[PDB]
Amino acid sequence: GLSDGEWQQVLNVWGKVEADIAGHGQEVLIRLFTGHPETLEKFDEFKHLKTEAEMKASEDLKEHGTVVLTALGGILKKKGHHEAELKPLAQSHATKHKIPIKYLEFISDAIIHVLHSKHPGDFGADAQGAMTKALELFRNDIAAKYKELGFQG
Numbered sequence: 001g002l003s004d005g006e007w008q009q010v011l012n013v014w015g016k017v018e019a020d021i022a023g024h025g026q027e028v029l030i031r032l033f034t035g036h037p038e039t040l041e042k043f044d045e046f047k048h049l050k051t052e053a054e055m056k057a058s059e060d061l062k063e064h065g066t067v068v069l070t071a072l073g074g075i076l077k078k079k080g081h082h083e084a085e086l087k088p089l090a091q092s093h094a095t096k097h098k099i100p101i102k103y104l105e106f107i108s109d110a111i112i113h114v115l116h117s118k119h120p121g122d123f124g125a126d127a128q129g130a131m132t133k134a135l136e137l138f139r140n141d142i143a144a145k146y147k148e149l150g151f152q153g
């Protein structure tokens with residue numbers, strides 16, 4: 001878990017994302033898809049957008065980016081008390097979408113990358129630590145539901 005000062009760091013960082021969630025959203029997805037091309041194949045609407053330029057030119061991709069970060073903001077504000085919100089997600093990602101936990105690791109690393117890239121010199125060492133921890137927690141709670149379901153990857 002995180003200390004209250006660590007949660008207060010995470011929610012301070014999140015305020016910066018909220019200035020523009022769609023712009024952050026699209027950047028996260030592009031880092032994901034360009035860094036790990038295998039992840040794109042999981043998206044039936046977007047698997048034709050293989051390069052960063054093609055990705056950028058899709059408003060459908062940006063709206064998907066919005067849905068994702070808005071789900072995650074919602075969860076971060078629960079300061080770890082998120083069992084009712086995480087259950088559906090883990091269930092749909094394991095059984096409908098068939099998303100290995102390794103992809104969740106990719107996307108968590110993509111968020112850190114994007115925060116340093118969009119806010120150079122404004123994303124402190126302390127801030128990085130707290131955000132990393134929150135994302136670990138999120139991934140670990142999902143990993144527990146995946147094991148329940150025997151979702152092997």
Ligand code: HEM
Pocket residue numbers: 039040042043044045067068069071072088089092093097099103104107
């Ligand atoms: C911060 C992590 C993530 C969040 C908050 C998130 C959230 C969501 C939400 C809210 C939906 C729509 C409802 C549903 O089907 O559950 C969704 C759909 C989906 N997610 Fe994620 N997701 C995350 C990570 C990922 C990753 C890493 C992948 C694949 C590499 C992925 C693949 C998909 C797919 C394929 C869909 C269905 C989209 C469609 O075709 O309509 N998700 N996700």
Ligand SMILES: [Mn+2]
Pocket residue numbers: 045
């Ligand atoms: Mn769809």
